[PDB]
Amino acid sequence: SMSYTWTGALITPCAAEESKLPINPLSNSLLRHHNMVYATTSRSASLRQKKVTFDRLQVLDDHYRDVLKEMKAKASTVKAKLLSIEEACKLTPPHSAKSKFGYGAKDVRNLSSRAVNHIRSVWEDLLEDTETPIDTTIMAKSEVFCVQPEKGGRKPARLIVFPDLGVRVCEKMALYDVVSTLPQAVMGSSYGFQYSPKQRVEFLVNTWKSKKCPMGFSYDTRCFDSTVTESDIRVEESIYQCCDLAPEARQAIRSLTERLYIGGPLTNSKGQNCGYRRCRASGVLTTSCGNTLTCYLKATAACRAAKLQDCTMLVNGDDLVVICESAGTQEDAAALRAFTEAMTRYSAPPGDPPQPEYDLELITSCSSNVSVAHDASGKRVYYLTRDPTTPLARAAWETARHTPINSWLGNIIMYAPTLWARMILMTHFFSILLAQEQLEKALDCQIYGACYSIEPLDLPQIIERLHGLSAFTLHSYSPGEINRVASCLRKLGVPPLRTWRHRARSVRAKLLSQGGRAATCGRYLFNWAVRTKLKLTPIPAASQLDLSGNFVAGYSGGDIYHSLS
Ligand SMILES: O=c1ccn([C@@H]2O[C@H](COP(=O)(O)OP(=O)(O)OP(=O)(O)O)[C@@H](O)[C@H]2O)c(=O)[nH]1
Ligand SMILES: [Mn+2]
Ligand SMILES: [Mn+2]
Numbered sequence: 001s002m003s004y005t006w007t008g009a010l011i012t013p014c015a016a017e018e019s020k021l022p023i024n025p026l027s028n029s030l031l032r033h034h035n036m037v038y039a040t041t042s043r044s045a046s047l048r049q050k051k052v053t054f055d056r057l058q059v060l061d062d063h064y065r066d067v068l069k070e071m072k073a074k075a076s077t078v079k080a081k082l083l084s085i086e087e088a089c090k091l092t093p094p095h096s097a098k099s100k101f102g103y104g105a106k107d108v109r110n111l112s113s114r115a116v117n118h119i120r121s122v123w124e125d126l127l128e129d130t131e132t133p134i135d136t137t138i139m140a141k142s143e144v145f146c147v148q149p150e151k152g153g154r155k156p157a158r159l160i161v162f163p164d165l166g167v168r169v170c171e172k173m174a175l176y177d178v179v180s181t182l183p184q185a186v187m188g189s190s191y192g193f194q195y196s197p198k199q200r201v202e203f204l205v206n207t208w209k210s211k212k213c214p215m216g217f218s219y220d221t222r223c224f225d226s227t228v229t230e231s232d233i234r235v236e237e238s239i240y241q242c243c244d245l246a247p248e249a250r251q252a253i254r255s256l257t258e259r260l261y262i263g264g265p266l267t268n269s270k271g272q273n274c275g276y277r278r279c280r281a282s283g284v285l286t287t288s289c290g291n292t293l294t295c296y297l298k299a300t301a302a303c304r305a306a307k308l309q310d311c312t313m314l315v316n317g318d319d320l321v322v323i324c325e326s327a328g329t330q331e332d333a334a335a336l337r338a339f340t341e342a343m344t345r346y347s348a349p350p351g352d353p354p355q356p357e358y359d360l361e362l363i364t365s366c367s368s369n370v371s372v373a374h375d376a377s378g379k380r381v382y383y384l385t386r387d388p389t390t391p392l393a394r395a396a397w398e399t400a401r402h403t404p405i406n407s408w409l410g411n412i413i414m415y416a417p418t419l420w421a422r423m424i425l426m427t428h429f430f431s432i433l434l435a436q437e438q439l440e441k442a443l444d445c446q447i448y449g450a451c452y453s454i455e456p457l458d459l460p461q462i463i464e465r466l467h468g469l470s471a472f473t474l475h476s477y478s479p480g481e482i483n484r485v486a487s488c489l490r491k492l493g494v495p496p497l498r499t500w501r502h503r504a505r506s507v508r509a510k511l512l513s514q515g516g517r518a519a520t521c522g523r524y525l526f527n528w529a530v531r532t533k534l535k536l537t538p539i540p541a542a543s544q545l546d547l548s549g550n551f552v553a554g555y556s557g558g559d560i561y562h563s564l565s
Helices: 042-054 062-075 085-089 105-111 113-128 165-190 198-208 230-240 249-263 286-305 331-345 389-400 407-414 419-435 456-467 477-490 498-511 516-525
Strands: 004-006 037-039 136-141 144-146 161-162 213-217 264-266 273-277 309-315 319-325 368-374 379-386 443-447 450-454
Touching: 004 042, 037 389, 042 136, 042 161, 062 165, 062 286, 085 113, 085 165, 105 113, 105 165, 113 165, 113 249, 113 264, 136 273, 144 389, 161 213, 165 230, 165 286, 165 379, 198 213, 198 309, 198 368, 198 379, 198 456, 213 331, 230 249, 230 286, 264 498, 286 309, 286 319, 286 331, 389 407, 389 419, 389 477, 407 419, 407 443, 407 450, 407 456, 419 456, 419 477, 419 498, 419 516, 450 456, 456 516, 477 498
Parallel strands: 136 264
Antiparallel strands: 004 273, 037 144, 136 161, 213 319, 264 273, 309 319, 368 379, 443 450
16 A cells, blocks of 8 residues: 555646745845755655655554544544534635635635535535545645755655645534544643643643653654555544534545545646545645544554553654653663554654653754743743754745745744744844834734734733743753754854844834834843843733634644634
């Protein structure tokens, strides 16, 4: 059983694609070694196809089956609603890809009769037809990176695979409530996406302290999406089907699974057949939910197979953290070998073999880690940080070129307490946004895979919700964190942190000189910048402001939209 089959027709672009950065004063202002920064393109898709195309040998044992039955019994608890066409339409991102059938996301949100009548038609088809493979498009994705310390080798583009806009809206009607509700119900504490960054570090610490002699390790699968077998996707359906479901919801899930999720034909931008998928599609609604469940299940079973004791995992799609009781240095390494041997039998080998860790801080997952800092009162605070290379590289791209998804905004929101996000990112973009009249224009960003639409001037509020107000006061970051940040500036050619401090003094002055929510941006975001730091107090409409069901689940490649909060 092969993950993909190719006819030889190319993965084709729809427009021109820029690779290298353009040299302009504003990006220079941030980053100097321009030629360290690249965007991916169609040209490398070939390469990506090679990494992602293989055969899958799966062998399931009793541990796996036991864990499934356990997961399923929890899933039996769920009652999931069928969404209305309207409800589902309003979950569609305004810039989601337009349909083959003469209407785009705008029309769907407007509930254009062409759109809703097509969607109704696509819905009925899921009820009438139970086997005909549903068309998907395959595209090379445009993502920006910094090149490897390994000379001049670049990641090839990733491949997105997604059904037409009308299918996608149906997917929401059928499966949205499921995909939002079930993972927590089945996986409890282990379900990553139920956690704000603050809550995620909380859970990791409390877990780490709850052990007598702790021992954590990160796991990650070489192309998880290709390792997802047809069987995996039907197992995953069997979990979903344990929900109380509307009859048409049950069939829709039944049809989507056979027709779309287990695989199907791949069409390119030009309309020709590239071939066939027998693994997970990156761009369906159930991708993140599927990946997480599948990973949780395979992982959980692999512990019991390697007799690790008191495992507590955190799962975010493909990304797996595990913290457990240690059996001694030499044992641990041997058990972790066996974990991997199990996962591999379940068709999920790792990129790089897990290595046991005896400090929580050295464990990295979802590209991020726990680091330590202190607040005003000097009492020691835990927060979530990241190697700033890729964030800064993208910040330099989105400065010198208009991007659909403003990644820098996402990172400030998410990594608000971190060193580099405050001193470099915040300063750089509030500088730009002030020069060009544009603090109030709402910008599109991406949190946990869902598209959000946020105004810069609501950042003190938002940051306070997620990380608390202490995220405006942290000051004594760990040596290793400062060492890592500093070495990253040297790599990309970013002016050392000293430099941003005055760029930021100027910068808190511009904002106080303007009142309103603009001023409390200056005051709160840049209290690290003045040497005569004033005190900070819980902002008014700044949590009890706007609330919702935001950070309750992930929708990576799931086409989900929240202007929420
Ligand atoms: O548009 C896309 C396409 C794909 N993906 C997702 O990226 C993965 C492809 O890449 P990998 O799964 O091999 O790398 P990864 O571990 O870094 O993936 P993430 O956890 O960072 O997501 C797949 O698991 C796919 O679902 C997106 O998030 N967006
Ligand atoms: Mn992976
Ligand atoms: Mn991953």
